Design a protein around this ligand. Structure first.
Ligand SMILES: N#CCNC(=O)[C@H](CS(=O)(=O)Cc1ccccc1OC(F)F)OC(=O)N1CCOCC1
Length: 217
């Protein structure tokens, strides 16, 4: 496996999004993962509709729109639904709306998804390198997370109780510290242009390898 990976360099990552006061990070994580697969399969980078998931991947999938959801069940919704609309056709409003899916605006599909074994950072490393960006959950409840600006994020108070959906788009080493390159959905003002380098191989720090999953087309 390569010592470092960065899917942004392969044009497989769309711009950072801003979720606002709607807890749709799970949906942004989900579309982000599918966005990379879509690029690998068709050669086109296209932002997918996180709103589509918020309004449509609801109760039947155990999701609660702006009040939280699962990346895996979101993937199953796309499979069951036979598609997901583009962000452009079904824009993000940061609120719970009625399902407005329309196949005429479909920009991607999903045939299956895979959930990686709990806490195995070596397995996650292989997935990011051989499959593409992977959806994961992290413990982002600590004050230090909101204030992160650079370097590699390491928080002694972090736990393996995840509550925030994000996307691992790479990994590497910075000044002797191994890290996971994570795409967040709190806009470009958060951390490094919307990204945060989180400690890697440090005991499943903040539970980054607790619940990883990725879709396939
Ligand atoms: N709001 C908001 C923003 N946060 C969310 O959407 C989070 C994103 S997650 O932690 O990665 C989902 C999750 C996946 C596997 C195991 C535990 C999880 O996380 C779980 F919280 F433990 O989910 C939730 O908070 N949920 C609570 C309601 O039911 C759906 C999941």
């Amino acid at each position: 496996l390569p010592d470092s990976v960065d899917w942004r360099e392969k044009g497989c990552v769309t711009e950072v999004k801003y979720q606002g006061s709607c807890g749709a990070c799970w949906a942004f994580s989900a579309v982000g993962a599918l966005e990379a697969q879509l690029k690998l399969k068709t050669g086109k980078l296209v932002s997918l509709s996180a709103q589509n998931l918020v309004d449509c991947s609801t109760e039947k999938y155990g999701n609660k729109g702006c009040n939280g959801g699962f990346m895996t069940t979101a993937f199953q919704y796309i499979i069951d639904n036979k598609g997901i609309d583009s962000d452009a056709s079904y824009p993000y409003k940061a609120m719970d709306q009625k399902c407005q899916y329309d196949s005429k605006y479909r920009a991607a599909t999903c045939s299956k998804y895979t959930e990686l074994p709990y806490g195995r950072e070596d397995v996650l490393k292989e997935a990011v390198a051989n499959k593409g960006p992977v959806s994961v959950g992290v413990d982002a409840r600590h004050p230090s997370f909101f204030l992160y600006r650079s370097g590699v994020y390491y928080e002694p108070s972090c736990t393996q109780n995840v509550n925030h959906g994000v996307l691992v788009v790479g990994y590497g080493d910075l000044n002797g510290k191994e890290y996971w390159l994570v795409k967040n959905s709190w806009g470009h003002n958060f951390g490094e242009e919307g990204y945060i380098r989180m400690a890697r191989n440090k005991g499943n720090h903040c539970g980054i390898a607790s619940f990883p999953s990725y879709p396939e087309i």
